[PDB]
Amino acid sequence: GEAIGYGYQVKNAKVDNSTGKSLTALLQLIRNSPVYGPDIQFLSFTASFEEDDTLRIRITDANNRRWEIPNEVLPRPPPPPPTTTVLSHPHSDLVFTLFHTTPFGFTIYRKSTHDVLFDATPIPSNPTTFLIYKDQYLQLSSSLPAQQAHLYGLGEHTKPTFQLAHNQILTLWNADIASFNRDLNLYGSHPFYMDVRSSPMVGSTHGVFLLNSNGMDVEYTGDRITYKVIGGIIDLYIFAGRTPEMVLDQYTKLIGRPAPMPYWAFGFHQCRWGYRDVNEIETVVDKYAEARIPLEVMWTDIDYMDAFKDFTLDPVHFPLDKMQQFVTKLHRNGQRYVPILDPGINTNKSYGTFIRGMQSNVFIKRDGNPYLGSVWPGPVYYPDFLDPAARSFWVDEIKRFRDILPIDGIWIDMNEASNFITSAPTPGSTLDNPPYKINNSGGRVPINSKTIPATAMHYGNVTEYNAHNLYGFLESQATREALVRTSNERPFLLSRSTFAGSGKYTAHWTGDNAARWDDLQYSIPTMLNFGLFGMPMIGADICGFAESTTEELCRRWIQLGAFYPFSRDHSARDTTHQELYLWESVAASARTVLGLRYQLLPYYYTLMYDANLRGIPIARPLFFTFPDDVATYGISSQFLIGRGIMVSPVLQPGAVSVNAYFPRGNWFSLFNYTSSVSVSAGTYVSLSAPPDHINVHIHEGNIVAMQGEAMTTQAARSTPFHLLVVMSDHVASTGELFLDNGIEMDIGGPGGKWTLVRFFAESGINNLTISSEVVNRGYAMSQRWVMDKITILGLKRRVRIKGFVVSVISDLRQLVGQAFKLELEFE
Ligand SMILES: C[C@H]1O[C@H](O[C@H]2[C@H](O)[C@@H](O)[C@@H](O[C@H]3[C@H](O)[C@@H](O)[C@@H](O[C@H]4[C@H](O)[C@@H](O)[C@@H](O[C@H]5[C@H](O)[C@@H](O)[C@@H](O[C@H]6[C@H](O)[C@@H](O)[C@@H](O[C@H]7[C@H](O)[C@@H](O)[C@@H](O)O[C@@H]7CO)O[C@@H]6CO)O[C@@H]5CO)O[C@@H]4CO)O[C@@H]3CO)O[C@@H]2CO)[C@H](O)[C@@H](O)[C@@H]1N[C@H]1C=C(CO)[C@@H](O)[C@H](O)[C@H]1O
Ligand SMILES: *[C@@H]1O[C@H](CO)[C@@H](O[C@@H]2O[C@H](CO)[C@@H](O)[C@H](O)[C@H]2NC(C)=O)[C@H](O[C@@H]2O[C@@H](C)[C@@H](O)[C@@H](O)[C@@H]2O)[C@H]1NC(C)=O
Numbered sequence: 001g002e003a004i005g006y007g008y009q010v011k012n013a014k015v016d017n018s019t020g021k022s023l024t025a026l027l028q029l030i031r032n033s034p035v036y037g038p039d040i041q042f043l044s045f046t047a048s049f050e051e052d053d054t055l056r057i058r059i060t061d062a063n064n065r066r067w068e069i070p071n072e073v074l075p076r077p078p079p080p081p082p083t084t085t086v087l088s089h090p091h092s093d094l095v096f097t098l099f100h101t102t103p104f105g106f107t108i109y110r111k112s113t114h115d116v117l118f119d120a121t122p123i124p125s126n127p128t129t130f131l132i133y134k135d136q137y138l139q140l141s142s143s144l145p146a147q148q149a150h151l152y153g154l155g156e157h158t159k160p161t162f163q164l165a166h167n168q169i170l171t172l173w174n175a176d177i178a179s180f181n182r183d184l185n186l187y188g189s190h191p192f193y194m195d196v197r198s199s200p201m202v203g204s205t206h207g208v209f210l211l212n213s214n215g216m217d218v219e220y221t222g223d224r225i226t227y228k229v230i231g232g233i234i235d236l237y238i239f240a241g242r243t244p245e246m247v248l249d250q251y252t253k254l255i256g257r258p259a260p261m262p263y264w265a266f267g268f269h270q271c272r273w274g275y276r277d278v279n280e281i282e283t284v285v286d287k288y289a290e291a292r293i294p295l296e297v298m299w300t301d302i303d304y305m306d307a308f309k310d311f312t313l314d315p316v317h318f319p320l321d322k323m324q325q326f327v328t329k330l331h332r333n334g335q336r337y338v339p340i341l342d343p344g345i346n347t348n349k350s351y352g353t354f355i356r357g358m359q360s361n362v363f364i365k366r367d368g369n370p371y372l373g374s375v376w377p378g379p380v381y382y383p384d385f386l387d388p389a390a391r392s393f394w395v396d397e398i399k400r401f402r403d404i405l406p407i408d409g410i411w412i413d414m415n416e417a418s419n420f421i422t423s424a425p426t427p428g429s430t431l432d433n434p435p436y437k438i439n440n441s442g443g444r445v446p447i448n449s450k451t452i453p454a455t456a457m458h459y460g461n462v463t464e465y466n467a468h469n470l471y472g473f474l475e476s477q478a479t480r481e482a483l484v485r486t487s488n489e490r491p492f493l494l495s496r497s498t499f500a501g502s503g504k505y506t507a508h509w510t511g512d513n514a515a516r517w518d519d520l521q522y523s524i525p526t527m528l529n530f531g532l533f534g535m536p537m538i539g540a541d542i543c544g545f546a547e548s549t550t551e552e553l554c555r556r557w558i559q560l561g562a563f564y565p566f567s568r569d570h571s572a573r574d575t576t577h578q579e580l581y582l583w584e585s586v587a588a589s590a591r592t593v594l595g596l597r598y599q600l601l602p603y604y605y606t607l608m609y610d611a612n613l614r615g616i617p618i619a620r621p622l623f624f625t626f627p628d629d630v631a632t633y634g635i636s637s638q639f640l641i642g643r644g645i646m647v648s649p650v651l652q653p654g655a656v657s658v659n660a661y662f663p664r665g666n667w668f669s670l671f672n673y674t675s676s677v678s679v680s681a682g683t684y685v686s687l688s689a690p691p692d693h694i695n696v697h698i699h700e701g702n703i704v705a706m707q708g709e710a711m712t713t714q715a716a717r718s719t720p721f722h723l724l725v726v727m728s729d730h731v732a733s734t735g736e737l738f739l740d741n742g743i744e745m746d747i748g749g750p751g752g753k754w755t756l757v758r759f760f761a762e763s764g765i766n767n768l769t770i771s772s773e774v775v776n777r778g779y780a781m782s783q784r785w786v787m788d789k790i791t792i793l794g795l796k797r798r799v800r801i802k803g804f805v806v807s808v809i810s811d812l813r814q815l816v817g818q819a820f821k822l823e824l825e826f827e
């Protein structure tokens, strides 16, 4: 019947003089409790400004090192070398206070508005509000203003809303659990949240990140949020914002900037678990072409392997000679090839990969011997991606395979790690039997369920208990290295399991979703979440992975999915086929929406550049552009592509309209520029949405450079640019275009083989000026890119060279690389 804990008192505390102030304190345990294991008696507590806009609060055992995510994995600045102690800096909005109460507390508030962002003041009678710090139970709690704080993140979980619902528990423990399941912990763990405040100073946003790889539950009740973490330390970062985009800049500066993607990765991808042989995949490619549906990349799932073994080919169904011919043909036709790899290596003694893995001792061990799992080929050992020797092995196996069969990228799956068996716990081990049970799979299921046991060991005598959540991330680092060492092109990989920082290495997809209307909608919050997580190259399996799709659902899904940053149709083997050519209405919608997507390729690519620079997501919440509009905070079924393009999908069967929120102003359909929406105060509009149409609109104030439709992205890149200029009465219009060869390793780097163009448009009382400014004109000029047309929306008078109307300036024949200034007059 003992209390869960008694908390800590401040024994000493002081702010450093003679440098950028930081605060150091020693805390002492008030009293022990047997509940949840041994209390740490003395804690070192530091608060320090890493940058003016980032505060770090680090709480460690004063007398012993504890597990921390290694710097080599996630490189970051090192730690600093009644009564209250205050830490403030003249150039920082964040003010930190240490309260010497019993038990102690701390807060962080804004110097400017006095809004308290994180409030770890305990309620003295209530231990659920204390800092508790036991070897396998860390508890950290903050109160929140229930109506004003709007929280987002804490992945990975499927939810019907993007804004986090009040009164829930979010569990972070990477697990092979299908994303068609609401609420449960899924493949990745992202202990970050964004907190957008509706007042004071509407739209004032901050971020909170707990840099910890251990299993945890995070309980959010609206007026409080509480972390319950089963190991490691508290290493808490607060990002000042104050805009949502600034918070992601600050967060990704810490965890890593989003990796760039090659231009081709924005083309359409096709995959299926169950393609039977090389003839079938060839036929799929042929049928896409016959249907005039763009197809950029053909994928092969585990079917291609010899009995589900990595780095092999089925000699009957996917023989090497035919596969070489297939890939050669793809390449001749401007297409690309991506195969799957699983992490588990089959233990067959006559399998070369196993022999080599054994020779280099690359596998995760338990009880002194390689840990034996079960996955698709049966028995497997798992490479230890924390071990440099295993990463070298992985690089070498990929090289060996690529030397025999060319590939363009890699899909890494099952990397939680997934295990089809659960091993018995080591008797007496509190790692395999932890004192606090996190809510794994929604049933307090033991952490070792269907994975590698916590007592397994990694390089450096690191336990699986501590390193589990890093496995997919580490495999992603190793796989990207393997690709970079075997091709000088910008690489492409897709990973299932992720951790904070994975976006610096890989794309992600939402995993095993289902062919259900619910999942169609769930793809939107998950897409938005992964942007916040610094993983902008995100999408869901179009038409649904599990269960058989329907014509209507698949039609609505390609309509939406054609706007995902990562756009792939994929399916399980036991379902009907769902290639887009199979139903005419799906094929016809696909041609329409992939046509617009392909016209938008230069825009997606520019946004990818922006994401790598500043962390800003490609697919972003409405509140990134309209943070002062509280109505946008709870939107979960619409999203932006870049600043000013909004996608408003139909998400229900039988619907021929959708009630869609429009922020203030004028919005123009990208499918028919004569069709527009104009609102004053933002409100809902019941948009027409017939079976063959999805609503996609561009807001006043924006300029977007398009290219033409084509069946491949390479062909698209050789077409003329058409500039879409949407005027606003209240502000000049702007836009941006980034150009390189589509595949440079270091995007926008000092080598200079790239151009950045900025566009401007402004109305005068009797004229209109449209112009560009160009950085590095040379590259763009040498690539012959032509701007041949400008379309001007948003005015009620026509314009020409010396309700709403549409003006078109044609046959310009100008070089994109040559800065221009065009003066137009009204008619
Ligand atoms: C292709 C694909 O294949 C594989 O995935 C498949 C999978 O194999 C299929 O079986 C299927 O799985 C579905 C399943 O059908 C669904 O039902 C669902 O399951 C979830 C439940 O619906 C949900 O309720 C919950 O279940 C909870 C219970 O709620 C809860 O009651 C409790 O139940 C048990 C506990 O299990 C017991 O341990 C114990 O509980 C104890 C506890 O142990 C103690 O510690 C203590 O606390 O006391 C308690 C209480 O006594 O008893 C309880 C009572 O009975 O826990 C349950 C959880 O254990 O969660 C379920 C999910 O876990 O969803 C699943 C899927 O998650 O479909 C999937 C997907 O198709 C592979 O795994 C997958 O990776 C594969 N996909 C990849 C492969 C390829 C091929 O290369 C690619 O093409 C793909 O792209 C890849 O992604
Ligand atoms: C390890 O790989 C071996 C080579 O692929 C497997 O043996 C081969 O199994 C083929 C298909 O199952 C069979 O047609 C081949 O004749 C045979 N080749 C040789 C050289 O033995 C082996 O499979 C197991 O052992 C053989 C002898 C049979 O009893 C199979 O049914 C077994 O599955 C693989 N070992 C394991 C444990 O899978």
Ligand SMILES: *[C@@H]1O[C@H](CO)[C@@H](O[C@@H]2O[C@H](CO)[C@@H](O)[C@H](O)[C@H]2NC(C)=O)[C@H](O)[C@H]1NC(C)=O
Pocket: 672, 673, 674, 675
């Ligand atoms: C683009 O949208 C406009 C506006 O809805 C369409 O023009 C209307 O067409 C209907 C007949 O379908 C006429 O009754 C209206 O008078 C038209 N309105 C205007 C303002 O001209 C136009 O047809 C659409 N374009 C395409 C290619 O579908």
Ligand SMILES: *[C@@H]1O[C@H](CO)[C@@H](O)[C@H](O)[C@H]1NC(C)=O
Pocket: 764, 765, 766, 767, 768, 769
């Ligand atoms: C015409 O545009 C210029 C800038 O391009 C602006 O400064 C000027 O005021 C405008 N003149 C009229 C008459 O609209």
